[PDB]
Amino acid sequence: ESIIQWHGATNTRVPFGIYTDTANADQEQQRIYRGEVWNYLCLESEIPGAGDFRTTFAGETPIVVVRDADQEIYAFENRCAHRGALIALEKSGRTDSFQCVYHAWSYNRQGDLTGVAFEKGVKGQGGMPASFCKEEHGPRKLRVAVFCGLVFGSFSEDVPSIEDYLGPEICERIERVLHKPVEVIGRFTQKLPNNWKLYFENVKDSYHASLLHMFFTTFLSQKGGVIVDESGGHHVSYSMIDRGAKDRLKDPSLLEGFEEFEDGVTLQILSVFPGFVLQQIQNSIAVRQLLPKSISSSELNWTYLGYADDSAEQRKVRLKQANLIGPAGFISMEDGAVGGFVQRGIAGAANLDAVIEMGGDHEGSSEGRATETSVRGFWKAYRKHMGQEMQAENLYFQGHHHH
Amino acid sequence: ESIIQWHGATNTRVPFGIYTDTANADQEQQRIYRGEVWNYLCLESEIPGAGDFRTTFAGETPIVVVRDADQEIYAFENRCAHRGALIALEKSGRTDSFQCVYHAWSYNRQGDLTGVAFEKGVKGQGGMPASFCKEEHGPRKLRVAVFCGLVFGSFSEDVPSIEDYLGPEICERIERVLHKPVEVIGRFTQKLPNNWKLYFENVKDSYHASLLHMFFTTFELNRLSQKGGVIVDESGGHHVSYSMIYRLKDPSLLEGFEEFEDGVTLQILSVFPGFVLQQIQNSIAVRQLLPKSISSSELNWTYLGYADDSAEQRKVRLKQANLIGPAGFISMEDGAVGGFVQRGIAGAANLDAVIEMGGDHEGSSEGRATETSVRGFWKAYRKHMGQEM
Amino acid sequence: SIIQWHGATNTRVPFGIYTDTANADQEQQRIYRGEVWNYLCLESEIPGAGDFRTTFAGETPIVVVRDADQEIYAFENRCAHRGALIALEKSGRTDSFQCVYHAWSYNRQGDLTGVAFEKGVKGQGGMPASFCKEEHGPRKLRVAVFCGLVFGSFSEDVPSIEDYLGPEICERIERVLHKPVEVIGRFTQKLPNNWKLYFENVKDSYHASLLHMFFTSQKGGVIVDESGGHHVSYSMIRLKDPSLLEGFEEFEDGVTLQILSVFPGFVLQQIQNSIAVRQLLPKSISSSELNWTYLGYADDSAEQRKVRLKQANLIGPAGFISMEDGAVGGFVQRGIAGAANLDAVIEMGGDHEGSSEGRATETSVRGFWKAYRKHMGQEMQ
Amino acid sequence: MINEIQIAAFNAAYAKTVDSDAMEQWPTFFTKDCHYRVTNVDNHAEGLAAGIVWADSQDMLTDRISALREANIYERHRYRHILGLPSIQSGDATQASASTPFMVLRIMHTGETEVFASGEYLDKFTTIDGKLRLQERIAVCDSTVTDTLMALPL
Amino acid sequence: MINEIQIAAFNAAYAKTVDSDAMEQWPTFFTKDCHYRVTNVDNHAEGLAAGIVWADSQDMLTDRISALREANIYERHRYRHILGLPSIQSGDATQASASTPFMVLRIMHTGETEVFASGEYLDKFTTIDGKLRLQERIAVCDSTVTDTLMALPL
Amino acid sequence: MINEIQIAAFNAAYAKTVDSDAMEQWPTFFTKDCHYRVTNVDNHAEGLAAGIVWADSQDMLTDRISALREANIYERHRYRHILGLPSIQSGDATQASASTPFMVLRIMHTGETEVFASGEYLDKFTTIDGKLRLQERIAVCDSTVTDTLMALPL
Amino acid sequence: KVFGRCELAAAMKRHGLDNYRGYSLGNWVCAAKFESNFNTQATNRNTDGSTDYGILQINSRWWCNDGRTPGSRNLCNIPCSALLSSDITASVNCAKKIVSDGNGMNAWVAWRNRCKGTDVQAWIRGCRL
Ligand SMILES: O=C(O)c1ccc(C(=O)O)c(O)c1
Ligand SMILES: O=C(O)c1ccc(C(=O)O)c(O)c1
Ligand SMILES: O=C(O)c1ccc(C(=O)O)c(O)c1
Ligand code: FES
Ligand code: FES
Ligand code: FES
Ligand SMILES: [Fe+3]
Ligand SMILES: [Fe+3]
């Protein structure tokens, strides 16, 4: 009957129902997006001044993220505490306070209700009862962390610190890319015809990536690996030359690049559960934000980056190498479509299981990239948040012996 | 754990799940639209002659409404009693009888089955069994009530008369505007990206009128400080909100003429579950609110003049119509705010709207800094829906 | 329940059968992936070794392909790795099928023959020792062919195509498809109705003269197989350009119209010299797809083929007859919007589900519901 | 020389006729012995000859509009044609072979607007009594899918 | 003489003004005593006079743009007009009536693109002091339905 | 003078090349040292330089078509360009800066038609050997959203 | 524009008027001479609310739409402004419809009084045709 039944404790089998079950999608909103995770909101440099705000989403839940006069960043649910209207209607702007258009309730930059129109009535008629207290009404506030300029938010006050959530290896791998001031050089959205999870598995899919990389070498010796944090939720996939090892295109400038990191890493893709990506592909730098939209649709928001210190020539290298990424990327183009190929391929198979066995039943770091360890890691972190580990009856049916 | 669980007997809290739960939406079709209510169909003057009909909806259910030779108006479900096809395919027309295109079953203007193609077979073979009786098959007929030219329909044998359903104050407030022959001067549909109930609450929301709409406050048309009131009938289902009295290169937009005995320059009237009669200065209109999907509704505008208007009075109504409808200096905002709520609550299906202005009262009030007419709606809703306490 | 049947008879059909989504999911399990034959394509569309088409059996995508033995194979278009579509093209010719996502390779039977990096890369990663290719693969279909028609089933227990069709349907198909056919055009109609409303429509001999006022002495009948699922409706003996309806003799009998249906979504039509096949697929609770394959005979002269191209004006999305068939389903879907708890009345020709002389009957419609209720486990005693 | 302006002007009058439901005038845009077909890119690439509509005389066009008026049942709707600039492949003062991009919106009487068809007209023009006329118009649709039915010609 | 080339040029500048958010220039396309109306085919066929926008002076057009900028609450969106060729219906030495097909896409700031309206402009043109101007523009919409609201004029 | 008619004719040949999948001829519409970019109104308003496609030579355009043919994986689809009349902002007998409205439909091999993009081409034209050529074409999309992926250039 | 006699003859010949509905080239040239004096912009306001337009003085009640004529039939389906152009195409196409109507060239009053039954071929001699 259930199409979301896990086969056992292992993540080598994933029930295809997980990509279509709408009750389960609603649990993802309660237990993942509004649970003990960090949701990527924006870069601090996108809201540099007092009053600067952007609107975004944490899962299905609309968010305001805003700089205050103390130079700190705050975030709160974009939901008026009256009758539930969106408070901020613009994608971005600058404001002293947020005012709901419907009945003119006012909110400060923390999300506190500061004003209720005609709260005290008119003459001595109507208005709120004496029992009504503004400080008891407000949208949910988010806990905010800024790590290397990345603004994350959580609905949960008990989420681990961003440092503990990421772990030291992911922290260093982010700092390696975001080591100096960055500048947004372009924004693009892709609407993906698949459940969010298929795109996030794709980011973590070193198997597909190393197949596709190997194909392009048809047109210097490299090694790769996969790093998975302890929770399973976060990965890095990298490829590197050994600096100081001995040994088609009409415009080769597409792939001409420059050394700018103190290591041999030519490619580093990093994911943070449940929907953040940081990429370095040669001199191509970007952030991605993955949002669920409907059971079979998701949104991928690209933020292309340069460094504030780029020369004209270095910036032009990034503008050319951007042809490798995004919606029309020489590399990423198919990343927009493979998820949809799965969504459709499983149309008559809601009761069957994906097979994820490359590199064994491991959810740890590995040398090489012919592995699905970082895909199994995602399902490890997913099942923990979702309460979908082996529990109670099914565990008992397995462990009721005496060998 | 239920997202449609009411938190108490009063209507100061409304569960946001009520705007998204699809099982509950299907109960609204059974218990409200096909229950003890009157559904607005059209004006009698839109079907003035024998045979004149329009098609419309009562909630999700398609309806035919038609004038017969006796000058009475009938209404029936637009559903063939054979295999369920729409019988009338046109928005409007004139006909002697209705014929289903699929297998040519015929209906009279009451919706009675008058003819079945090949009922007695062809050359002695096939046809209906002897047991088949036309008189036992037909679409559901509606009870029809006409009040000041307003044609309402009910599925319910038990619903009170239209006069008793509306109550005497709503009756007088409709008569006040529809006191003389009216003429349709335009039809426009607004597709609203929200559950029907968010628009119907909005019409009843005296609190928002001066706050959402700069025009009502900037040009001192509909301020809370002006004389006025909110009326709620005994059921809670029906209301009246009424009122008495940035620059413009052409002030003729708001130039008007006196035509009501009282001084009342704004009267908005709602009749459960989806009828609105508006008077905003000299701008007269009827609105019909229909549910379409859980997060979509349709607002059908019927713009009115009086048959006796002079050229100059009619031109004043054509100019003031810029205030209303899909591009209205007022109404454009009313089409969007519903969607702002639908989207604002997307992560909040388990939380509650706060409706506390003017207390937990569901009665009439002087002043308009109240939500009494919004609470009235939920009182009438919970009673039809069996969601009391 | 809005899918509650009123009786053992099919003179009443619950309107909820056209809107209930749980019931639609059971139709995929018990009809499309059950004891039926699903029409896939014509032999003449995949004549040579490696020729394939992609299509559907209900919601389930399918690959159908000719191999070097001249046999036809079919399998579910679902990679046994992470579930991607294997073949992305409507048609083509190939040695083997390859999933583009991680390059798993399949033979023309649907067997997994290759797994990219199965043994790892430079001795790292790859599948465990326990991984065996022969244990992984899309579901294979049984294929049957009949007079150039290619059918597929998921079920080991479905009867032979001859026993499924029965002898009368077999003869009536062979009468049209007695020699090689050639596709002369393809057109799809997206129908705004539940699939079942279109399939009932094809079986509705009652509507033919009434919904289509185009022609408006000769006699007709309705044949229903033993299961009820298959029918034939047949008929036998102003315009500035009468050439529209000028025709030529090519059938031994005098039969000028033959419409034939095979449960759950196959139609073979002969209207004068206008020959076609249709494939009906469910898409969503209130949407379906009708795929037309217009046919000539490979031996047609220029003059006979021109007759078929003119008479095609009768059929398809703009047909002087079939235009209305695309819309009436939708009229039902909308007419019942407030009536999920009420019943269709299907009483023309009695409560009979058998063959009849004359066409003022709904016997072939009731036959459909008899075969439907049996597959779906909804029969009352 | 027949040019792109003259062909665009003809195409706009053709569109206005079909979009105003003045369907009785549609056949007068064609010669007596014309060809008109509605097909799709797949049929056209494979060389398949059938059309959803297939006519080899102006009288077949007239009969199709007679059937539309007196015989055929369909729900009320209109077309809105949006045409691109024509490309001329060959011709002279009398004849021209040309291709014109098109899009057709369908608007139901109930208000729904959809992209119903898009593609190119592959046309042969002649001149009769000093006026452009279609000897041949093949409406090659980009999609193999027609939503519900096609009552009005493209 | 007013001709199809002049009207095509005017219609492209009108579209560019409305689509660019230079809405302040929109009133300059009209005479002082102009008429502008947005209506639909049903109202137009029945002879009903009301518009969702109705203006009998250039100053009413200016007021509508002032409201759009400073006063009205609506979600941010933009238009994309795709226009057909103008067809001149009537004219003499100095005046012309014409019909121009239009389609308007609405693009929300959040990225959704819809066909928002389609129909024809029913226009009366004059030339005053060298400028082509609308004495009248009636946007007759194919659909009776406006999705959500209409803030920007067609 | 480069005029609106010459640019409309060039734009129709550009569209026909892209919509017929004769993509090998697409680079010939450009100068050797051209600029081509696909971007959106938000990037353009903020002065952000990056494109979904970004090219500063004809050779980069050729390489993109090579990759489309030999390297890229995408589900089969086609474009239908519907263009409006151009507006010239400035220019002479050999140079012009101009803006052309566009809409692109995407038709999947499976039959779905969607509005895939809309906006304006912001173009700099030059004349090489008497013939119009793009020195620069910036496709400024109305929407920040691309559905699935973009394989073919706009 | 003011046409030359022979310039107009050649233009009318090239638009297929020589013997159109039995009427030799000279009848068409002679008709333009006395209707308009070879002036493409000629306009004559009649007392019945109609106006005659262009080189063949075509009337706005029956044939073209000028937007100011009550009871306009517009049987040539053209704006009368199309008959005031330098180019005679629209006027010739409309003339071919008028002359086909059953009354031949008698619709042109100046033709009937000044041209009918005269040596109309005199209007085309001295011309390259
Ligand atoms: O090498 C990898 O493992 C890898 C994975 C994902 C991407 C991606 O862009 O999503 C990439 O570029 C490379
Ligand atoms: O003052 C009010 O209560 C009020 C409510 C609704 C409307 C409306 O137009 O829907 C209005 O104009 C005024
Ligand atoms: O006579 C009949 O029973 C009949 C039924 C269906 C069709 C159809 O084309 O779907 C037809 O042509 C004839
Ligand atoms: S909903 Fe925000 S103030 Fe009322
Ligand atoms: S469904 Fe109406 S006559 Fe059959
Ligand atoms: S999903 Fe097919 S090879 Fe991976
Ligand atoms: Fe309001
Ligand atoms: Fe039929």
PDB file of N, CA and C in Angstrom, chain D residues 94-126:
ATOM      1  N   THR D  94       4.056  37.451 -61.520  1.00  0.00           N
ATOM      2  CA  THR D  94       2.771  36.697 -61.444  1.00  0.00           C
ATOM      3  C   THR D  94       2.762  35.621 -60.324  1.00  0.00           C
ATOM      4  N   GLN D  95       3.864  34.865 -60.155  1.00  0.00           N
ATOM      5  CA  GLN D  95       3.974  33.642 -59.316  1.00  0.00           C
ATOM      6  C   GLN D  95       4.966  33.911 -58.206  1.00  0.00           C
ATOM      7  N   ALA D  96       4.807  33.280 -57.037  1.00  0.00           N
ATOM      8  CA  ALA D  96       5.850  33.274 -55.981  1.00  0.00           C
ATOM      9  C   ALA D  96       5.664  32.046 -55.094  1.00  0.00           C
ATOM     10  N   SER D  97       6.772  31.451 -54.693  1.00  0.00           N
ATOM     11  CA  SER D  97       6.906  30.387 -53.684  1.00  0.00           C
ATOM     12  C   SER D  97       7.476  31.031 -52.426  1.00  0.00           C
ATOM     13  N   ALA D  98       6.791  30.875 -51.294  1.00  0.00           N
ATOM     14  CA  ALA D  98       7.168  31.579 -50.066  1.00  0.00           C
ATOM     15  C   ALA D  98       6.753  30.796 -48.828  1.00  0.00           C
ATOM     16  N   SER D  99       7.387  31.123 -47.719  1.00  0.00           N
ATOM     17  CA  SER D  99       7.185  30.489 -46.401  1.00  0.00           C
ATOM     18  C   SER D  99       6.937  31.604 -45.392  1.00  0.00           C
ATOM     19  N   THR D 100       5.896  31.458 -44.573  1.00  0.00           N
ATOM     20  CA  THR D 100       5.445  32.452 -43.584  1.00  0.00           C
ATOM     21  C   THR D 100       5.263  31.760 -42.239  1.00  0.00           C
ATOM     22  N   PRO D 101       5.964  32.214 -41.182  1.00  0.00           N
ATOM     23  CA  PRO D 101       5.736  31.721 -39.843  1.00  0.00           C
ATOM     24  C   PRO D 101       4.350  32.131 -39.347  1.00  0.00           C
ATOM     25  N   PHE D 102       3.734  31.290 -38.515  1.00  0.00           N
ATOM     26  CA  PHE D 102       2.438  31.640 -37.882  1.00  0.00           C
ATOM     27  C   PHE D 102       2.366  31.097 -36.466  1.00  0.00           C
ATOM     28  N   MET D 103       1.511  31.736 -35.681  1.00  0.00           N
ATOM     29  CA  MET D 103       1.028  31.250 -34.397  1.00  0.00           C
ATOM     30  C   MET D 103      -0.476  31.534 -34.406  1.00  0.00           C
ATOM     31  N   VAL D 104      -1.242  30.610 -33.865  1.00  0.00           N
ATOM     32  CA  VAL D 104      -2.712  30.743 -33.692  1.00  0.00           C
ATOM     33  C   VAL D 104      -3.023  30.549 -32.219  1.00  0.00           C
ATOM     34  N   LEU D 105      -3.566  31.577 -31.594  1.00  0.00           N
ATOM     35  CA  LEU D 105      -4.253  31.483 -30.295  1.00  0.00           C
ATOM     36  C   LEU D 105      -5.678  30.978 -30.533  1.00  0.00           C
ATOM     37  N   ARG D 106      -6.150  30.106 -29.651  1.00  0.00           N
ATOM     38  CA  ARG D 106      -7.583  29.785 -29.540  1.00  0.00           C
ATOM     39  C   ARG D 106      -8.123  30.403 -28.268  1.00  0.00           C
ATOM     40  N   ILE D 107      -9.201  31.160 -28.408  1.00  0.00           N
ATOM     41  CA  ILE D 107      -9.920  31.738 -27.259  1.00  0.00           C
ATOM     42  C   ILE D 107     -11.304  31.085 -27.234  1.00  0.00           C
ATOM     43  N   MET D 108     -11.557  30.269 -26.217  1.00  0.00           N
ATOM     44  CA  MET D 108     -12.905  29.714 -26.007  1.00  0.00           C
ATOM     45  C   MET D 108     -13.885  30.859 -25.654  1.00  0.00           C
ATOM     46  N   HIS D 109     -15.178  30.693 -25.970  1.00  0.00           N
ATOM     47  CA  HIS D 109     -16.269  31.598 -25.506  1.00  0.00           C
ATOM     48  C   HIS D 109     -16.243  31.773 -23.968  1.00  0.00           C
ATOM     49  N   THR D 110     -15.731  30.789 -23.238  1.00  0.00           N
ATOM     50  CA  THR D 110     -15.617  30.798 -21.758  1.00  0.00           C
ATOM     51  C   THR D 110     -14.345  31.526 -21.290  1.00  0.00           C
ATOM     52  N   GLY D 111     -13.470  31.980 -22.198  1.00  0.00           N
ATOM     53  CA  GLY D 111     -12.414  32.943 -21.803  1.00  0.00           C
ATOM     54  C   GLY D 111     -10.993  32.418 -21.857  1.00  0.00           C
ATOM     55  N   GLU D 112     -10.792  31.093 -21.927  1.00  0.00           N
ATOM     56  CA  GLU D 112      -9.453  30.451 -21.901  1.00  0.00           C
ATOM     57  C   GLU D 112      -8.722  30.806 -23.206  1.00  0.00           C
ATOM     58  N   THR D 113      -7.490  31.296 -23.107  1.00  0.00           N
ATOM     59  CA  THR D 113      -6.615  31.577 -24.282  1.00  0.00           C
ATOM     60  C   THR D 113      -5.471  30.576 -24.267  1.00  0.00           C
ATOM     61  N   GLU D 114      -5.278  29.830 -25.352  1.00  0.00           N
ATOM     62  CA  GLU D 114      -4.141  28.867 -25.453  1.00  0.00           C
ATOM     63  C   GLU D 114      -3.433  29.100 -26.775  1.00  0.00           C
ATOM     64  N   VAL D 115      -2.156  28.776 -26.839  1.00  0.00           N
ATOM     65  CA  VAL D 115      -1.442  28.599 -28.134  1.00  0.00           C
ATOM     66  C   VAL D 115      -1.956  27.301 -28.742  1.00  0.00           C
ATOM     67  N   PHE D 116      -2.735  27.384 -29.794  1.00  0.00           N
ATOM     68  CA  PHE D 116      -3.432  26.237 -30.403  1.00  0.00           C
ATOM     69  C   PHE D 116      -2.585  25.585 -31.484  1.00  0.00           C
ATOM     70  N   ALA D 117      -1.861  26.399 -32.252  1.00  0.00           N
ATOM     71  CA  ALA D 117      -0.982  25.881 -33.321  1.00  0.00           C
ATOM     72  C   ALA D 117       0.107  26.909 -33.609  1.00  0.00           C
ATOM     73  N   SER D 118       1.218  26.437 -34.119  1.00  0.00           N
ATOM     74  CA  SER D 118       2.279  27.318 -34.668  1.00  0.00           C
ATOM     75  C   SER D 118       2.971  26.562 -35.789  1.00  0.00           C
ATOM     76  N   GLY D 119       3.665  27.280 -36.678  1.00  0.00           N
ATOM     77  CA  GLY D 119       4.371  26.589 -37.755  1.00  0.00           C
ATOM     78  C   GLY D 119       4.683  27.536 -38.893  1.00  0.00           C
ATOM     79  N   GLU D 120       4.622  27.027 -40.128  1.00  0.00           N
ATOM     80  CA  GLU D 120       4.844  27.897 -41.290  1.00  0.00           C
ATOM     81  C   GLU D 120       3.867  27.457 -42.351  1.00  0.00           C
ATOM     82  N   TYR D 121       3.383  28.439 -43.077  1.00  0.00           N
ATOM     83  CA  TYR D 121       2.683  28.232 -44.348  1.00  0.00           C
ATOM     84  C   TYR D 121       3.730  28.056 -45.442  1.00  0.00           C
ATOM     85  N   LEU D 122       3.658  26.982 -46.205  1.00  0.00           N
ATOM     86  CA  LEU D 122       4.490  26.777 -47.431  1.00  0.00           C
ATOM     87  C   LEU D 122       3.546  27.031 -48.605  1.00  0.00           C
ATOM     88  N   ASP D 123       3.716  28.165 -49.265  1.00  0.00           N
ATOM     89  CA  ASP D 123       2.720  28.740 -50.199  1.00  0.00           C
ATOM     90  C   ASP D 123       3.290  28.788 -51.623  1.00  0.00           C
ATOM     91  N   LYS D 124       2.396  28.611 -52.591  1.00  0.00           N
ATOM     92  CA  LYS D 124       2.584  28.992 -54.005  1.00  0.00           C
ATOM     93  C   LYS D 124       1.499  29.988 -54.333  1.00  0.00           C
ATOM     94  N   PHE D 125       1.920  31.151 -54.764  1.00  0.00           N
ATOM     95  CA  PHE D 125       1.039  32.290 -55.139  1.00  0.00           C
ATOM     96  C   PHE D 125       1.029  32.405 -56.653  1.00  0.00           C
ATOM     97  N   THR D 126      -0.137  32.731 -57.169  1.00  0.00           N
ATOM     98  CA  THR D 126      -0.362  33.204 -58.538  1.00  0.00           C
ATOM     99  C   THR D 126      -1.126  34.525 -58.460  1.00  0.00           C
TER     100      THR D 126
END
